[PDB]
C-alpha cells in the first residue's frame, strides 16, 4: 500500500510491551573479554536480534534455510541483522513514572 497519512498519538504501556521484543533486566552492555552482548543486557541478541546475517549466537543455525526459527540453546532468532535498527526493548518500572514532556511543558497537560 501507499502511505497517505502520518498519525502521532500516545502509547499505552500495553502498546509499549507489544513493541517490545523483551525486557532488559541487566544494566550491562557487552562481555569485557569476548566483546559480545551480555545476556538480558542492552545489546542482548535474544531480544533485539542477531549480530550477523542469518546466524545465531552459538552458531547452531548459520544459514537462511532457518528463518523465523528461534534457536534452543542461545534463544537467538535466525534472520537479517538489520532488525537491530528496528526491534524495540522495554523496561518495566517498579513504580509509575511521569513523562516529563506532559509535566514541564507549560501549561502542564497533566496539571
Amino acid at each position: 500500500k501507499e502511505v497517505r497519512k502520518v498519525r502521532i498519538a500516545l502509547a499505552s504501556p500495553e502498546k509499549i510491551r507489544s513493541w517490545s521484543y523483551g525486557e532488559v533486566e541487566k544494566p550491562e552492555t557487552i562481555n569485557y573479554r569476548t566483546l559480545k552482548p551480555e545476556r538480558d543486557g542492552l545489546f542482548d541478541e535474544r531480544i533485539f536480534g542477531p549480530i550477523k546475517d542469518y546466524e545465531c549466537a552459538c552458531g547452531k543455525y548459520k544459514r537462511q534455510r532457518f528463518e523465523g526459527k528461534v534457536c534452543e540453546r542461545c534463544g537467538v532468532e535466525v534472520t537479517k541483522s538489520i532488525v537491530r535498527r528496528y526491534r524495540m526493548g522495554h523496561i518495566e518500572l517498579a513504580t509509575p513514572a511521569a513523562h516529563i514532556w506532559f509535566v514541564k511543558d507549560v501549561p502542564s497537560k497533566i496539571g
Partner: protein
C-alpha cells in the same frame, strides 16, 4: 641593490620585543631562574600559597618548589609526539599538632609544559599558542540604570571564578538593596553584620539628602551582629539549618576569605583609586578578632549616594574604556588552571588524612598528583585559548602570539557580545589595532596588539608617548595607561619640528581621544611614531593612508596566509619593518658575536668568535610545519667571511637577505583582458612557471598503526595478498615505501595485513573457491595508500617498534609507521593570489608568453589586473605601489616608504622621470626613433588630455610615464592598445588556499553509523551536504524527482542506493525510490519517547514501513 628611504619622522625608540607578551608573562609565572627564597607571591608560587596549609596527620604545609630539566629536547618532542615540559617538585612537611612530629619530603607533582624561545608551546608533538584574553578588569563600577534615569547601579567585580558579582541598587521604595547570586536583600542588614551602628551610618551617609532614610531600618539595629548574621544566612540559604558556626563560615568565604574571594591586583588598585580608600587585603572585608571588618562596602555605598544625589566628583564608568579593560596573558591563564588543579589535590589530601593510619603518614602518601596533571593537561589541550599554532610563514607565528580574544572561558559568550564590545574604542589608540580583525561573526572579538603597545604588570595595555616641555620635545618616553593618557594633551607624530622645538603655531592633538587644534604651549606630549597606531601586519602595508580600512583589513589578514616560496623576494616597496619581523620571529639565523665564519654547509654553519670558541649552528632543512608549509634555513654567508654581532647567517623560510619575503615582485599591467580577469579573477604569464616564481614546497604526514587484535595481530609486511610486483615495486623488504620514490594516488605507502573477521563464506564464495582451486588467505589488505588527489616524493620514514629501546606505545599497539611525503607546487589555475592592499583573486587563465601584452622593447608583463577592482574598493595603495614600482624596475632600486610618512607624488614623479631616461633614452642610442603605433596612442592620449598637444613624441611619452602609463602592444595582434596602460612592479603573494587541496568528488562511499547518510569531509571521502536552503531551491524550481533523488537514492535509502548503482552499471534506468532510512530512525526515536507514530493509508489502516521486521 640600493634602497632609498623616505619620510622625515625619526623614531626615538625602536620596537619592543614583539613576543614579550608571551615570553615575559610565562617567565613571570614560572620564575625558574629565580632561587626559591627570592620568588614573589605571583605565579604558580601563588597557587601553593593559596592552597597550603591544608588542615583537618593534621597539617600539611608548603615550603618551596623547583623545576627540573626537560626529559626531552624541543625537536625530539615533536618527533615522538611528546610534550615539552619540566618536572615539578614541591617540598612539603606533615605536622601533627598534638604529637609535634614533623615529616618532611619532596614530592613529584607531575610535569609542567614549557614555552619555547619564540613564545609558543609544544603539546603532544604539535606546536600550540596560548592566545591572550581581554575582559572587564576587576574593581568597582557605576553605570546608569537603563530602567531608571537619574538612578545608578554600583557593581563590585572580582576576578573570574574568584567569587560573585555584587550589585548595589536604590529601590523604587527607597531602600538600598544588594544582589548576590541573584538574591535581593536590604544592604542595611549586611552593614549591621560588619558592626555598623545607626550612629556611624547617620554621620557618614547623612550628608546626602534623603538617600539615608532608605538605609534606616529599626528592626536591623535592634539586633547585635550575631543575630543579623544568622538573619542574613536564612535569606541566602533556605533549608539550611542556621547554625552560628556554619553562618560565619559562609559569609567569611563569600566575603572575607582571600582563599575564595579575590579581587585582582589591578582590581585592588582600581577600587582604591575610584573610592579614594586603601585596601589592606584583596577581599571585600576581613575576619578580625572574632568579628567582621568592612573594607569596600561603606565607601562604595558612599560613592553611590553621592552619584545619585548629583554630588560633583562622582561620574559613571565606561566599561569599554581600555583603563577598565585588562589583558589576561598566558601566565595568568595557566595560573588559574594550576590554581584549580591544586585545590583538587587539596580535596584529596583532607580525604586522605581522614583515612589510613594517623601515626604513619608521609607527604608522599597524602599527595595525589593526578588531579593537578589533569587540570594542566586540559588547559594545554582542550582549552579555548590554547590554539593550534599558525606556522604558515614567520609572520603568521608572530601575529598569532600577538592576538587578543574577548571570547573563551570566563569571557563573553557569543550571544552576550553586542556592538559595544566589538566597536573600536577611542582608547584603542596606540594599544589595539583598529584595522586587523576577522571578517564575519568574529569581528571585534579577536584583535591584535599595537606595535609599540605594552601590557603592564596590572594587565592593562600601555602606549608610549614623548615628554613635551615648553614646546620642546624630549627623548623621554612615558608608557601610559588609557586612564593616564586622558589627563594630557597629546600632539600628532607628524607635527613639524625644527630640531627639538615645535615649528608650527597650530598643532593637531587629542584630549581624551577628542581631536583638537592647540598651541605648542598647550602640548604636554607627542606620539612617538605613526607605527604605534597599527599592528605588525598592518604596518607591512605601504601607502596605507591611500587604502580604505576595509581592504587594508584584508591585506593585513592575508599576509599571514602567505605561503613561503622557494624563490621568494622582499617587496620592492617596503614599510621598513620587514627586517624586525624576521628577527623577532626567530626565522633567520644571526651571529651571536663578532668573528669569522669557519664553515659553510647546507646542513651546517660553524662560526669562530672573538673568544676563540667554535660554535656550530645546525641548519633546519625542509621541516614540516603545522599547516604543511616547508620551513628551511639557507646559509647567506661564505667560508672565511668576516661577520659582526647581529649579522645574518642563514635566511629562514619566507625571507630574503634578512628581509621578510611573503611573495614575488612581478610586473603588472592594469587592464581588462577578454573577460578572463572579470570579477577579481587574475590572468598570469606562463613565464612565471618557467622561472619558478610562485612555487612552494609542501609536506604531508601519513601515519598507520599495527595493533594486537583478538583475531590475531596486525603487522607491517611486504607480503600483501593478491598484489603484483608493480604494486610492491617501491616497497622495501619490511613493506615500507623507500625514500625518494614518487607516489601517486592509489599507491601503497606502508603495507599492512590484518586477520579477516570471522567469515562465513557465502555459497557464491565457496563455489568460486573450488573452481580456481585456491584456499582463501587468512589476512587481508589493510595497507595505507595515498588518498585521492594527493601525492609527491617521500623524504622520510619513521618507525617505532614495541620491544625496542626507548619505544613504548599505547596499549595494544605493536608498531607505528610515519611516512613523510613532500611536493613541489607550481602556480596553477584556481590558486589564490593577493597583494598587501586587499586585492585578491584566483588565477583564471595562464597565457603563453606570446599572448601577453608587452612593452615596446618586447618585454612581456607578468600579471594582468582588472581596473574595475579599484574604484569600488577604494584602495589606491596598490596604484601607488605600482607607480613607484615602475620606477624601481628601470632604476634597479627598491624603496622604504613608511606608513603615513613616505613618498609623496612629486617625489615619485622625480624618480619616474629618471626611469624614463633609462627606459626611453636607451632606445635613441640604439638607433631607433618612435614607432608608428606609439604615435597612434599618443594621438589618442591628446584626446584624453593625458598629454599636452604640440610637444614632441618623446616629451609626450615622458608625460605618460610620469603618470605611470606606457604604450602597450597586444601580443595576439601586434596592434597597440588604444590607450596608455598603467604598468609597474607590484608585490603579490600566494595564499594558503589552493585548488589542489580544495578539489573533491565522490560517487559513492562511507556512510554514517546511525543516519546511514554519506560522511562529511574530504579526508573521509564524503559527499556534499544538500541543506534546507538547497532543498527550497529545488522546490522553488518545482523539480520533484531531482529533489526526491537527493533525499533517497543519493543519501539514506539503503535499498534505493544499492539498486541505483546496480542499475547504472547494467545500463538500466534508476528504480523508484523507497522510504529513506533516517525517517525510520525518527519513528523509532519517537517510540523511545512513548509516542506512537503510525503511517496510514487513505482508509486509515496502518502501513508497515519496516516490512514486518519490527513487528512480532
Amino acid at each position: 641593490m640600493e634602497i632609498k628611504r623616505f619620510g622625515r619622522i625619526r623614531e626615538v625608540i625602536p620596537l619592543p620585543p614583539l613576543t614579550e607578551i608571551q615570553v615575559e608573562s610565562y617567565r613571570r609565572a614560572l620564575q625558574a631562574d629565580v632561587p626559591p627564597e627570592k620568588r614573589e607571591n605571583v605565579g604558580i608560587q601563588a597557587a601553593f600559597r593559596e592552597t597550603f596549609p591544608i588542615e583537618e596527620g593534621l597539617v600539611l604545609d608548603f615550603l618551596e618548589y623547583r623545576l627540573g630539566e626537560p626529559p626531552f629536547p624541543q625537536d625530539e618532542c615533536r618527533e615522538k609526539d611528546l610534550t615539552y615540559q619540566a618536572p615539578l617538585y614541591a617540598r612539603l612537611q606533615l605536622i601533627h599538632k598534638d604529637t609535634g612530629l614533623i615529616k618532611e619530603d619532596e614530592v613529584f607533582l607531575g610535569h609542567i609544559p614549557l614555552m619555547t624561545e619564540d613564545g609558543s608551546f609544544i603539546i603532544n608533538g604539535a606546536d600550540r599558542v596560548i592566545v591572550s584574553q581581554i575582559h572587564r578588569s576587576p574593581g568597582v563600577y557605576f553605570t546608569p540604570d537603563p530602567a531608571r534615569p537619574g538612578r545608578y547601579i554600583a557593581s563590585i567585580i572580582p576576578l573570574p571564578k574568584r567569587g560573585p558579582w555584587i550589585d548595589l541598587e536604590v529601590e523604587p521604595n527607597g531602600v538600598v538593596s544588594m544582589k548576590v547570586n541573584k538574591r535581593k536583600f536590604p544592604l542595611v542588614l549586611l552593614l549591621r553584620v560588619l558592626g555598623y551602628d545607626q550612629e556611624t551610618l547617620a554621620r557618614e551617609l547623612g550628608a546626602y539628602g534623603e538617600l539615608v532614610q532608605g538605609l534606616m531600618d529599626e528592626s536591623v539595629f535592634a539586633m547585635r551582629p550575631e543575630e543579623a548574621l544568622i538573619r542574613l544566612f536564612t535569606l541566602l540559604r533556605p533549608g539550611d539549618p542556621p547554625k552560628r558556626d556554619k553562618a560565619v563560615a559562609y559569609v567569611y568565604g563569600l566575603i572575607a576569605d582571600p582563599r575564595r574571594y579575590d579581587l585582582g591586583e589591578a582590581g585592588r588598585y582600581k577600587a582604591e583609586e575610584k573610592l579614594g580608600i586603601r585596601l589592606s587585603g584583596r577581599t571585600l572585608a576581613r575576619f578580625e578578632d572574632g568579628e567582621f571588618k568592612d573594607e569596600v562596602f561603606l565607601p562604595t555605598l558612599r560613592y553611590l549616594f553621592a552619584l545619585t544625589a548629583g554630588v560633583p566628583g562622582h561620574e559613571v564608568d565606561d566599561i569599554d574604556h581600555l583603563g577598565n579593560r585588562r589583558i589576561r596573558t598566558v601566565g595568568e591563564l595557566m595560573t588559574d588552571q594550576f590554581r584549580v588543579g591544586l585545590a583538587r589535590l587539596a580535596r584529596g589530601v583532607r580525604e586522605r588524612m581522614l583515612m589510613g593510619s594517623e601515626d604513619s603518614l608521609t607527604p608522599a602518601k597524602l599527595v595525589n598528583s593526578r588531579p593537578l596533571e589533569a587540570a594542566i593537561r586540559e588547559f594545554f589541550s582542550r582549552s579555548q585559548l590554547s590554539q593550534f599554532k599558525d606556522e604558515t610563514n614567520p609572520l603568521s607565528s608572530l601575529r598569532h602570539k600577538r592576538r587578543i580574544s574577548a571570547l573563551g572561558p570566563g569571557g563573553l559568550t557569543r550571544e552576550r557580545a553586542g556592538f559595544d564590545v566589538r566597536d573600536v574604542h577611542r582608547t584603542h589608540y596606540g594599544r589595539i589595532c583598529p584595522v586587523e580583525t576577522p571578517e564575519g561573526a568574529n569581528i571585534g572579538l579577536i584583535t591584535s596588539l599595537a606595535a609599540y603597545a605594552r601590557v603592564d604588570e596590572l594587565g592593562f595595555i600601555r602606549t608610549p608617548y614623548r615628554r613635551v616641555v615648553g614646546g620642546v620635545v624630549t627623548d623621554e618616553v612615558v608608557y601610559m595607561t588609557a586612564t593616564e593618557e586622558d589627563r594630557y594633551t597629546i600632539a600628532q607624530a607628524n607635527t613639524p619640528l625644527e630640531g627639538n622645538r615645535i615649528a608650527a603655531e597650530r598643532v593637531v592633538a587629542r584630549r581624551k581621544g577628542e581631536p583638537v587644534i592647540v598651541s605648542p604651549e598647550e602640548v604636554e606630549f607627542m606620539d612617538v611614531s605613526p607605527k604605534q597606531v597599527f599592528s605588525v601586519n598592518t604596518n607591512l602595508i605601504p601607502f596605507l593612508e591611500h587604502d580604505d580600512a576595509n581592504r587594508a583589513l584584508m591585506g593585513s589578514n592575508m599576509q599571514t596566509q602567505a605561503v613561503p616560496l622557494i624563490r621568494a623576494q622582499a617587496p620592492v616597496v617596503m614599510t621598513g619593518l620587514e627586517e624586525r619581523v624576521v628577527r623577532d620571529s626567530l626565522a633567520a639565523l644571526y651571529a651571536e658575536e663578532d668573528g669569522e665564519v669557519a664553515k659553510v654547509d647546507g646542513n651546517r654553519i660553524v662560526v669562530r668568535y672573538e673568544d676563540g670558541r667554535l660554535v656550530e649552528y645546525p641548519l633546519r632543512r625542509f621541516y614540516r610545519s603545522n599547516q604543511g608549509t616547508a620551513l628551511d634555513q639557507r646559509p647567506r654567508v661564505v667560508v672565511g667571511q668576516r661577520v659582526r654581532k647581529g649579522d645574518l647567517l642563514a635566511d629562514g623560510p619566507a625571507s630574503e637577505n634578512g628581509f621578510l619575503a611573503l611573495g614575488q615582485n612581478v610586473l603588472v599591467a592594469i587592464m581588462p583582458f577578454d573577460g578572463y580577469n572579470f570579477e577579481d579573477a587574475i590572468v598570469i604569464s606562463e613565464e612565471l612557471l618557467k622561472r619558478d616564481f610562485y612555487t612552494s614546497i609542501h609536506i604531508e604526514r601519513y601515519e598507520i598503526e599495527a595493533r594486537d587484535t583478538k583475531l590475531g595481530p596486525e603487522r607491517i609486511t611486504r607480503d600483501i595478498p593478491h598484489l603484483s610486483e608493480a604494486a610492491l615495486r617501491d616497497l622495501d623488504e619490511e613493506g615500507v615505501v623507500r625514500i625518494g620514490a614518487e607516489v601517486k594516488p592509489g599507491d601503497i605507502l606502508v603495507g599492512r595485513t590484518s586477520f579477516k573477521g570471522e567469515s562465513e563464506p557465502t555459497p557464491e564464495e565457496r563455489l568460486l573457491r573450488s573452481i580456481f582451486g585456491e584456499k582463501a588467505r587468512d589476512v587481508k589488505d589493510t595497507s595505507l595508500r595515498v588518498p585521492p588527489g594527493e601525492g609527491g616524493i617521500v623524504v622520510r620514514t619513521v618507525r617505532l617498534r614495541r620491544g625496542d629501546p626507548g619505544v613504548e606505545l599505547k596499549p595494544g599497539v605493536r608498531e607505528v609507521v610515519r611516512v613523510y611525503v613532500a611536493q613541489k607546487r607550481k602556480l596553477q589555475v584556481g590558486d589564490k593570489l593577493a597583494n598587501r592592499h586587499g586585492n585578491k583573486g584566483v588565477v583564471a587563465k595562464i597565457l603563453p608568453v606570446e599572448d601577453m601584452p608587452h612593452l615596446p622593447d618586447g618585454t612581456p608583463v607578468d600579471v594582468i589586473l582588472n581596473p574595475l577592482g579599484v574604484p569600488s574598493r577604494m584602495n589606491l595603495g596598490q596604484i601607488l605601489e605600482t607607480h613607484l614600482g615602475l620606477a624601481g624596475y628601470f632604476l634597479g632600486q627598491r624603496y622604504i616608504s613608511p606608513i603615513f610618512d613616505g613618498a609623496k607624488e612629486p617625489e615619485i614623479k622625480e624618480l619616474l622621470a629618471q626611469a624614463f631616461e633609462v627606459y626611453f633614452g636607451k632606445r635613441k642610442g640604439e638607433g631607433f626613433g618612435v614607432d608608428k603605433r606609439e604615435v597612434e596612442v599618443l594621438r589618442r592620449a591628446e584626446k584624453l588630455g593625458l598629454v599636452t598637444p604640440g610637444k614632441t613624441p618623446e616629451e609626450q611619452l615622458k608625460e605618460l610615464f610620469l603618470q605611470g602609463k606606457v604604450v602597450l602592444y597586444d601580443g595576439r595582434t601586434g596592434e597597440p592598445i588604444e590607450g596608455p596602460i598603467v604598468v609597474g612592479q607590484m608585490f603579490i603573494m600566494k595564499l594558503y588556499h589552493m585548488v589542489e587541496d580544495k578539489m573533491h568528488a565522490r560517487s559513492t562511499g562511507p556512510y554514517s553509523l546511525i543516519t546511514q547518510q554519506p560522511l562529511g569531509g574530504k579526508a573521509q571521502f564524503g559527499g556534499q551536504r544538500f541543506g534546507e536552503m538547497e532543498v527550497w531551491a529545488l522546490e522553488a524550481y518545482g523539480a520533484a524527482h531531482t529533489l526526491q533523488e537527493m533525499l533517497t537514492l543519493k543519501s539514506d535509502d539503503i535499498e534505493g542506493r544499492n539498486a541505483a548503482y546496480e542499475a547504472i552499471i547494467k545500463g538500466e534506468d534508476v528504480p523508484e525510490p523507497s522510504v529513506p532510512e533516517s525517517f525510520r530512525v525518527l519513528v523509532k526515536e519517537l517510540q523511545a519517547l512513548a509516542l506512537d507514530v503510525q503511517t496510514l493509508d487513505e482508509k486509515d489502516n496502518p502501513v508497515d514501513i519496516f516490512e514486518g521486521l519490527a513487528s512480532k
